[model samples]
Target: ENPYERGPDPTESSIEAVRGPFAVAQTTVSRLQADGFGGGTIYYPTDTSQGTFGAVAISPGFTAGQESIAWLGPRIASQGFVVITIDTITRLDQPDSRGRQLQAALDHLRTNSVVRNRIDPNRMAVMGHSMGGGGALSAAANNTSLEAAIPLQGWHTRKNWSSVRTPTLVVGAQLDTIAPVSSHSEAFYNSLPSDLDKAYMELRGASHFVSNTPDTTTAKYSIAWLKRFVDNDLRYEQFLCPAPDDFAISEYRATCPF
Candidate 1:
């Protein structure tokens, strides 16, 4: 049995909702109060009876602020996690810098954040959009201990991500001109170690800014990935293994039977 499991039994209806079972709350951190990275908001499940939950650090793409990614905070946290969607020190920061910032954010969550006690430090993950998504790739690579990663329409100069050992879910928008799937998400997904627990999801009729909204496809798979890897919750695996047949999905690929 998984001591890490937090939520009720999963169903197709449960995973597709805009929010999940856990009642959520949030706290905002200021840039000056944080170290090594800009501070943002921390969203956590208000139900503490289940014990500590895994945490996720999220970043916005280049020329963007936390507002661009804030939608994911409560959405993911409500599903049973402590999720922090952050801002880069500057809007122009590159992928590597953003990656380091994500690491820093994860560190801050484990130590300085008010929600530190609510998080399981060892079961942390990273996520981002566009350049921030690229940063997710770099962060996962740089921090092999990270439990999982999800890069949404990630845009990065480097294509290969062989150094990453964390379970990763690469999400791409099929029509994205900003971060073309062929060169960015697809290539990044293909570059992951063949034996690694990874999956690639291509969104049909979507663009780079797709992650900016409350997209069900992104939310569901992301929840599954984090649940499977971070929480060690195999019950969530059913949502991923068959490779979703939803219409919003243009394509889905995975090193399955995970």
Candidate 2:
């Protein structure tokens, strides 16, 4: 019944695999070509056999380059989407600025990117780490049309997101001193509109830079969230429903009866 479903029929092994079915190819966007945000690397499925794919724009934390969030680019792109791990205008840019850059990056992706023809412009998402994580939330709030938001150990001063209309999955780390779940992830999850499609997961014994590395836990659920929301692919829903139980997760929460 779903039209946006892509890739192979997902299985436990497939969902947890390091890479998805599509072979990935990547290209770079230089600063001169970039409109609002810094230039970035776009990782995308090489196959044109499939119809247009959804896309995601990711940002790094404060005082950090795109490398911090680069791991997620090919990781997520390999699964199905065109993923862009973007550099900020400056390393010290705040979440709000990062948020704007994320949107700008998305615009560039939709209209001017090399992979533009491979993307479904309407189905887009935002993600980030640390302060950039906060920026993911800001982007989601400012852009209600956004399909999803995944903020890893997000840090932000704006606590209440009662007005946010996007579906979000806030990933936090148990041992993150920089942005503890108590004040950041947990609060961010709680702040989303009660009826919004959202979920929260905290990595057990993880640090603020959890998303910076290769992580099965983060990749698994993130892929599931994007699949379920962006692609509207219920084939990935089995992993999400019942709110996943795993050793790597300290806690998982979601609105029930989905």
Candidate 3:
């Protein structure tokens, strides 16, 4: 059955009610000569009694390092996903290059002795902020195996997105001058195939740095989307479909058929 096909009925739980239930731990992986990039930090659940978890790889924006997006590692990991926050060799590299860097980070985590059996190799996702956000989209475009991709204030030079098959969530900030929504986020969302499982979210009065820290609004939906697509967890269906109403959100559009 198609993972995107309609699933069970959504539960009565509210999206904001869900919290990170697991304790998390962090470790660093040194840069490998073959990976062609600097090292990255990995965050995972300390208690894995529930079994292997899905994973996500994150890339920071241009001129930004792992610290910029490090908050997400522990946040998402606590929600039952192994998260890796990576650094690029050259901060000025294009989105496509950063995309490959994300891939390398995931590849390293999957093979790491510490994480060998703790994560599901087939259930993986990519995420990025600004230029790195664009990289997340690029990575998904290049690797069809990715279950989902989320780009926050992403900037991409490519307009052709017909080939991207992975489920995606494009987040835009209303007051961002760095990568204006009209030209960057909105364009990226529009370029995707209409039939694909996708969503577009614009935060009211938010800046480009909105995703730099751990944000409840960002984490809530992000974790839900990953759970739904990457882990095939139907419990998140309630949050993804019918698009909840939030005063913090200025615009929200979704193709989820739940």
Best model number under lDDT: 1
Question: 66-142 in candidate 3: lDDT tens per residue?
Answer: 99998888877877788989999787988999999989888887778888688888888999999999999999999
**lDDT (CA) per prediction:** 0.92, 0.89, 0.84
- Candidate 1: residue 67 lDDT (0-100): 89
| Sliding window of 10 residues with minimal summed lDDT for model 2 | 107-116
Q: Residue 144 error for model 1, in Å?
A: 0.8
Candidate 3: Cα lDDT at 10 = 39
1 against 3, candidate with superior TM-score: 1
TM-score against truth, every candidate: 0.98, 0.97, 0.92
Give the number of the best model, judged by TM-score.
1
Model 1 stretches with alpha carbons more than 4 Å out: none
Model 3 local distance difference test score: 0.84
Tens digit of lDDT per residue, candidate 2, span 27-109?
A: 99998888999899999999878788998999999999988878888888989899999998899898889999999999898
Q: List the residue pairs that clash in candidate 3.
A: none
lDDT computed for candidate 2: 0.89
Better of 1 and 3 by lDDT: 1
Better of 1 and 2 by TM-score: 1
Ranking by lDDT: 1, 2, 3
Per-candidate RMSD, Å:
0.8, 1.0, 3.3
lDDT of 1 at 72: 93
